[PDB]
């Protein structure tokens, strides 16, 4: 139920499925899902004080989905940062039982 | 026109205006010039690939 | 006495006005 999944050898279209749950709707044209994720959670920001305790997780959240070039430290410090704080969710290769530990 | 049975010719000045515009599309191209970037995508290692 | 016609101070400040013009962010702006 975590995961929405569909496969078979060709495509089998059920037709007792029904309508989707979705709603379609227009917005912005993005190049990639990162410039989106920046996009909005740069909307998300900039409606909160300076105070708010919040503001940390967003905006290393933030650092966490934008790409360049030569900023392989700066994002393994990021990455780790929002491990120890209990935010990035360790996807089970060696940070759940090195990082966390 | 023949003029008494010469070809002097007609006088035919040029006051060039529509350069101005032109060279500043130029000017404005060249001090923000851009090129191809690749952008990364949603697998472990893909940040290598477009580096 | 001496007169001015009007053509020759038509082409005076005509000519005047289109070497300034034709002669010449911020510094694309700049010629």
Redesign the interface.
Known sequence: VVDRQTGAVVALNDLSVGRYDVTVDVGPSYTARRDATVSVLTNVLSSMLPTDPMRPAIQGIILDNIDGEGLDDFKEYNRNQLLISGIAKPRNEKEQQIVQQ | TKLDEQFEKYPKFE???VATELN?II??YR?NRITVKF????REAS?EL?? | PAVMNQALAALLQQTSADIQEVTGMNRADMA
């Open positions: 006051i060039n205006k500043r000017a404005e001090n952008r990364p995508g949603d940040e477009a580096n």
